[PDB]
């Protein structure tokens, strides 16, 4: 049948400040985190560990990729499941990569 | 209890190109994505084959990941999959310095000469 | 929905060292791996401890991630844990330029100078 849980995404209404950490409070109000799952929330942990995850939950997993160039402020984007990050080396930066048993190395050199 | 769902991986033979977007088609045919979970598969109706309120399985977790690529100048992208518990090492040599810092889930990789 | 499974985290007790892989071993102590889900732990029958067709939990989701490492030439690796909703910044300074563009979830980070 249907399986559901009460996990919210950052950016959703009814976020409870006293129920979360300051880190999550900061994510709640940032655009870059909007729509990523809020996995933490604490009455002491609201959605218990032993709660079924849903496929909709998986669609909301990710991390935030940012780039800074000098003083210029950070630009941020979400890396969700099956998104791609390309590291591209132009002149005169050489970017090479190896991959052994789940360990991926991106090398940078002149 | 044996919990299952109908989620496929990219590269699976019976993915239907007609019913899905160009973005998904592009992932479906790349070896780089092969075996990653296909979360965004649609039917004729342009609705998701597997609805949000479906049990996720441990098998599903084993197919989560993102694609990591490097491209030098004009040459074509070399790609790998970063799956759960994989490691990505950014290494500086040959005149390039790479350093890192971490604080409260905020990680920084810094590149210098 | 109340649900459980037998998945443990790297760093947890009762890890059968001789029945598991070298990599898992290589991971179960490294601090950067601690608390990350041990997805592929084997049992005494030399099969996966938790089969593919088992419900995943929110507790599992809280343990998903990957390891981000850096190496400055000769020095040792510095490693840190990247979990869901962590941020990773790529910063360029004297005098590497690090710029980024994104389109349809493909993110390009470009290194110049």
When the candidates are 3.90.1780.10, 3.40.1650.10, 3.30.360.10, 3.40.50.720, the CATH number that belongs to A1-110 is 3.90.1780.10
Phi and psi, residue A7, nearest 5°:
-65, 140
Torsion of CA A84, C109, A65, C70, to 10 degrees: 100
Q: B104 CA to chain A: closest CA distance, Å?
A: 8
Q: How many helices (H) and strands (E) does chain B have?
A: 2, 7
Backbone angles phi and psi of B25, in degrees to 5: -50, -45
**Cα Rg of chain A (Å, integer):** 18
Report the C-alpha gap between A86 and B68 in whole angstroms.
6
Closest CA to A95 of C90, B39, B81, B69: B69
| C interface test, pick of A4, A30, A53, A71 with most C CB neighbours within 10 Å | A53
- Residues of chain B in contact with residue C79, where contact means CB-CB under 8 angstroms, are 87
This structure's resolution (Å) is: 2.0
Task: Name the structure determination technique.
Answer: X-ray
Q: What is the DSSP track for chain A?
A: -------EETT-S---GGGS-HHHHHHHT-GGGTTSEE--------S-TTBB-BHHHHTT-EEEEEEEETTEEEEEEEEETT-EEEEEE-TT-EEEEEEETTEEEEEEE-
- Taking CA–CA distances from C69, the nearest residue in chain B reads B89
- Tell me how far the alpha carbon of residue B42 is from its chain's centroid: 18
Which CATH code for domain C1-113?
3.90.1780.10
* CA nearest to C22, candidates A100, B57, B42: A100
What span, in angstroms and rounded, lies between the C-alpha atoms of C42 and C36?
16
d(CA B51, CA A59): 11
Q: Which residues of C touch B56 (CB under 8 A)?
A: 55-56
Chain C residues close to B93, C-beta within 8 Å: 73
Residue A100's contacts (CB-CB under 8 Å, 6 or more residues apart) are: none
B53, A105: Cβ pair inside 8 Å? no
Q: Which residues pair with A97 in a beta bridge?
A: A106
**Beta-carbon-side half-sphere exposure of residue C37 (alpha carbons within 13 Å):** 27
Inter-residue contact A76 to B26 (CB < 8 Å): no
Half-sphere exposure of A88 (CA within 13 A, CB side): 18
Q: Is B53 helix (H, G, I), strand (E, B) or coil?
A: coil
Inter-chain residue contact C3 with A50, CB threshold 8 Å: yes
* C-alpha R_g of chain B: 18
Judging by DSSP bridges, how do beta strands A62-69 and A72-80 pair with one another? antiparallel
Distance (Å, whole) CA B79 – CA C77:
23
DSSP-H helix ranges across B1-113: 22-28, 58-61
């Amino acid at each position: 049948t249907p399986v559901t849980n009460k996990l919210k995404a950052y950016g959703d209404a009814n976020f409870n400040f006293t129920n979360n950490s300051i880190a999550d409070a900061e994510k709640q109000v940032q655009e870059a985190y909007k729509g990523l799952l809020n996995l933490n929330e604490k009455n002491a942990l609201l959605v218990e560990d032993n709660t079924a995850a849903t496929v909709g939950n998986l669609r909301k997993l990710g991390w935030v990729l940012s780039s800074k160039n000098g003083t210029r402020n950070e630009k941020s984007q979400q890396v969700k499941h099956a998104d791609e990050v390309l590291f591209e080396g132009k002149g005169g930066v050489q970017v090479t990569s190896t991959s052994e048993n789940g360990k991926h190395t991106i090398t940078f050199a002149l």
